[PDB]
Design a protein around this ligand. Structure first.
Ligand SMILES: Brc1ccc(N2CCCNCC2)cn1
Ligand SMILES: Brc1ccc(N2CCCNCC2)cn1
Ligand SMILES: Brc1ccc(N2CCCNCC2)cn1
Ligand SMILES: Brc1ccc(N2CCCNCC2)cn1
Ligand SMILES: Brc1ccc(N2CCCNCC2)cn1
Lengths: 196, 198, 201, 194, 201
């Protein structure tokens, strides 16, 4: 098997519409890159971050004995978790090529760099303790038995008007009026402040 | 039947162009779940709203025997027929913020609940008083009349606490209107959003 | 015939690229703007932001069907139909289509398409704040089809105009023209819709 | 042959990826200015609306009791890869993207375009006006594959008015490539009305 | 072989999804040709740049016998494999201003040079001084590591707009190889340092 073959098989046989269930365990980890437009009045922030998403799809696995361990695949050719930011107020602008990593064991990783507007608590952004903006990310349509989400300044721009004090992640499981099942989400708390 | 099979059948056989009318109008439930109010302009009479447009209807052609099968799957709306709902007083096109997937239940019940950000032209007068403004949003089928599509109704439950606004009350009303172009009557739902500045 | 069959036939056999001209005559296209809202007037720059239904009506017999025991009408995605290449000559933004892009096809082959459009125009905004109002003239015609392939004609009424606009409509008049352009020897038809409107209090 | 047949043949057999070179393709470019929307004399940026009348020949589209002309989606035709070198926004096409194909194989495409340019806006408020120079040519085809050549509707409601339009053809060599690429420079001489 | 045949083969047989690796990483040349600097903000540390992103690599599977054939064709990038380059410090998605066509030479040499407008996060301090600001732009493969894709640099103002509010003092390029937390391999990038300043009074 070479890359050409592996990609050919994936394209022919992966079922992008089909959740690779046996719940699918989805890792979500936000890597903040920039904070661009804070508004303390309206409580809205403009954030640039890598949405590192990781899950497993065994139907993509291959014998890597004399083959590559990894390939890059267009996400249009793969099933992808339907993650959404609940408190996003703009649709996600994907800044990067929409390719994922598929490892021979069936491990998939997709890490787009996203610019997005959020509605969150921006109060205290200009103080030393800073503001704490809470970002809620989960599967839009898959409940806890189908998709489970779990957590996992390094790449933060030194040229931002803001710095990052702390990032904490917290997993929740919420029931909504529409549906009887529980949906999981990850709440990433971004504690940041305006530099001097 | 597993998911793979069900989704395969749906994709192969659903007819997204074809309204799944049975014997009668497809009965479409519409329920707006307000999430945020973002800009208000009392001069221009325009508001910017974020809301879940929970839409529910029935398509028997999608039904399957759920004996030893899943009760529910998630399907791309591009592979399903979807009611052609529009907000009559919208002045921007709907920005869909969420993955465009619907629920199909084994009985053929379909639910689609996108989160939408949209601008409306409505009555914003009194937004800064304590009785608040009452913005009326009109949603109905754009091209299907009452005998093809009928719409029916189903507050601060998911509304953001970080909005500069708060919701006093949400009331829903069903109407049936005849337009100059066409002899038949088209149904709509008018959702009245009563809100005020904090 | 049921809906499924009719839609199937249309999808298989309609030729969206092919103007349904008959007997070497022109396709008669009705254009009627139903104004919904006026959003952003600028008397300095002479630009207005308008929301309107562009009710477009024409005939493709090749879509026609025996409606004896069949529906009289279906809704069809415009991507599956030939559509007149109408353009607003004095538009300065591309048309933002607000509504689902579906047309009516009636069993006789009559097609109607009525998108709600938001668009900016360059027009005469002078007098918008007076009692006689401004008169903005909107020019709509086929971009590439001349008078012998496409003819445009007017069809009526503040009927659907928003009561919550800062503006109110005094009068709407329509007037058909036939113009020759430098590029081409043939004449192209257009409709000029005159929107007479003014600011409210 | 009727329209249906001609369009069917074009669709089946035209090769949109294939430049209709005959043993360069001669492309006519003629900007018909419709409107000038915004001008910043500080930033040297203008917002213009114009018809980009483009004309060329593709014999592989020619045909013999038939129509002399059809309207064809440009996605079904080969189209010159023209670009405005000093544009700073991508072109917003305002009009239906259809071209004229004439039975002899002459193709004309005239989209109405709104676009922002970086050019000399100095003097826009004087009597002699500013002169904004717009540079249009093939992005990827050199002079042997594509040659560009030069060849009223301006709105009376613009704040601006057009004094003169002059066109001039150039042939430039770029660092990347050994061949020369042709362009047309359209000089738009305009001023603010008083 | 004529153009039609060569383009037909390419469309039929090129594998856009498949990196054209040849026993060794694909060698990708990156060279930014700055055209304009549009909107500097010294407070927010953001710049709006227009530049040609001249990208060059080799794909032997596209090669052909050019004996009685063209030496070069223009091919839609959707029919070719293209390096997944990204600007790490870009804060808007790249606006491609030009037709998305690449050159394929008969030897399999591919060149793609879109004109891009993009907003970057970088050091804008000193933009109004005589020594100027130095904005550092980091471009590399998003998903291919050093053994799959290697990036290499290839004057300054050759095509820079004389009508910009800015002038270019110097452009330097620097190749790096970085390991990220996610992955065990090293990813290459090029850092283009754009030294520019506000033009005087
Ligand atoms: Br269909 C369908 C059903 C439920 C939901 N949501 C409710 C449950 C958790 N995610 C938020 C939206 C969305 N689409
Ligand atoms: Br085609 C076609 C026919 C009628 C309508 N409208 C009239 C019927 C009710 N909703 C408003 C849209 C739109 N397109
Ligand atoms: Br192709 C082609 C030929 C002519 C025109 N125009 C001229 C005739 C009427 N509308 C204005 C544009 C547009 N495209
Ligand atoms: Br591939 C490729 C090669 C060269 C060019 N440029 C240089 C020659 C003509 N105009 C500027 C574009 C564009 N793409
Ligand atoms: Br999938 C996948 C793997 C690696 C990366 N990044 C890390 C390595 C270099 N480019 C920056 C993003 C992103 N997505």
């Amino acid at each position: 098997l070479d890359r050409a073959d592996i990609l050919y098989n994936i394209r022919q046989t992966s079922r992008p519409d089909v959740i690779p269930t046996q719940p699918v365990a989805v890792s979500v980890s936000l890597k903040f890159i920039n904070i661009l437009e804070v508004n303390e009045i309206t409580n809205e922030v403009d954030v640039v971050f890598w949405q590192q998403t990781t899950w497993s799809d065994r139907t993509l696995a291959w014998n890597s004995s004399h083959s590559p361990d990894q390939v890059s695949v267009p996400i249009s050719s793969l099933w992808v978790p339907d993650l959404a930011a609940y408190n996003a107020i703009s649709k996600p602008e994907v800044l990067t090529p929409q390719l994922a990593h598929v490892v021979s064991d069936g491990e998939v990783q997709y890490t787009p760099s996203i610019r997005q507007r959020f509605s969150c608590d921006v109060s205290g952004v200009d103080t030393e303790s800073g503001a704490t903006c809470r970002i809620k990310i989960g599967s839009w349509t898959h409940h806890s038995r189908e998709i489970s989400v779990d957590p996992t300044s390094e790449y933060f721009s030194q040229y931002s008007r803001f710095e990052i004090l702390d990032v904490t992640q917290k997993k929740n499981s919420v029931t909504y009026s529409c549906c009887p099942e529980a949906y999981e989400d990850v709440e990433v708390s971004l504690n940041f402040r305006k530099k001097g």
